[PDB]
Symmetry: C3
Subunit: 182 residues, 3 copies
């Protein structure tokens, strides 16, 4: 009873204080052509846009490693003709860093995000170590992504949008716990 | 043939020796009100108890990091009205340490332990970094858990019970391999 | 348009250059009695062989840790009478290293490789830390595996086969991306 009252008061106090703190991120305008699939409470959102016959899909996959600077991981899929080119990437200081480049003959499997689909794809070839590739190849991959809008502007939007939604999720977190304990 | 005979003899010898070794953990009495779901050979057991209209669920999730001292991870769910407050915790020297605090609007999903359910929840907001919260809030969370029996006594029971069942699982391990190879 | 042309040219160039590079692994002859389940583009293949009433199954599970020397992880299952002895192992310099030894009463579950099956098995007893076992026991386990063909010869075949298929997967990777971008 009392402990629940304390938690109720504490969450309300934080919600009120938080809203008065400076630094509250402003909501970024979504890049032209991109659609966004983001719901309150869901941190790993997805973005999509068409590129002629291809569809470009951006799926956040996580945040990693101890770090002073926040680095996010995401997959970029380019789907066309039932197949997909899948780029394993991370955003480091407003820029996209390619970590892996995989090719999926089974585009349907590539798009499937179920736990079972993830396991099946984990057994597939993950492409070469980027470090074993010459610049002409690596640069061509980066130019290919840039021609499709996957550039610093988009990487920049991802950080900005993530901060804003994290802030919104945090306040919704406080409010829902307050209601729950009340 | 011979190798199997050797393995058969070796496991029997260990089983006999083990039973004569000192330090065999004694079976802990389960805390009042708590029910326990533990079967031989299953290391990650679950504990449950009611708290009025709420149900409190303890699910061991693992053991981690290289360590001189054994640290276990577990989730503590407080379910009520179709929603759940989920505490990501670990037991460090008889005490509960809160690592994460999440809120799940979809209590049914929160309770679902399938691989698919885990993946879906991995994309949800994981709450704030405990380090960014003031003591008044953090202490209120700890008091809330304590009022429900999630205290040092329970943390202490978890270590004790885990040691005892590990010991039992080890002997059952020796015996089943012996029978298998025979 | 241009970026895609560049990527098309770059992949073709690499494919042509790669084929002229020395060091191309030669295809290993599969050990007697073993069957192999490997498809182009699939890195984690499985090997199987019968041993009287038992079936021995080798399933690659990954590659790990930063390393100058490539170390692979795999599970070795010995199934008989609806039960399985499961060895968690890794290949380090042509030799098998036992990391874990588990026993599965539910052989069907042991054989199930679905994401859901993996999660269920992750909650089971994982056997003792090999470091807490005397040589007589550990050596008996190694002899048991050796009598079934799981020896340095097989470990050696796994590295050799993996290198050859990695090389094949790499060239197929270049070719499929080239066709895709064209």
């Amino acid at each position: 009873a009392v402990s629940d009252q304390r938690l109720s008061e504490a969450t309300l106090r934080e919600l009120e204080d938080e809203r008065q703190r400076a630094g509250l991120p402003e909501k970024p305008e979504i890049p032209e052509g991109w659609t966004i699939d983001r719901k309150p409470g869901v941190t790993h959102f997805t973005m999509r846009k068409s590129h002629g016959d291809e569809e470009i899909i951006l799926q956040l996959t996580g945040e990693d490693r101890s770090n002073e600077e926040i680095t996010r991981t995401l997959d970029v899929l380019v789907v066309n003709g039932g197949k997909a080119l899948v780029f394993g990437m991370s955003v480091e200081d407003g820029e996209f860093v390619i970590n892996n480049v995989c090719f999926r003959h089974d585009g349907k499997l590539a798009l499937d995000t179920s736990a079972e689909a993830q396991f099946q794809k984990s057994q597939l070839y993950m492409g070469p170590d980027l470090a074993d590739l010459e610049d002409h190849l690596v640069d061509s991959f980066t130019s290919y992504l840039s021609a499709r809008g996957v550039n610093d502007t988009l990487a920049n939007f991802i950080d900005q949008f993530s901060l804003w939604s994290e802030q919104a999720d945090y306040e919704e977190w406080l409010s829902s716990i307050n209601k729950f304990v009340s």
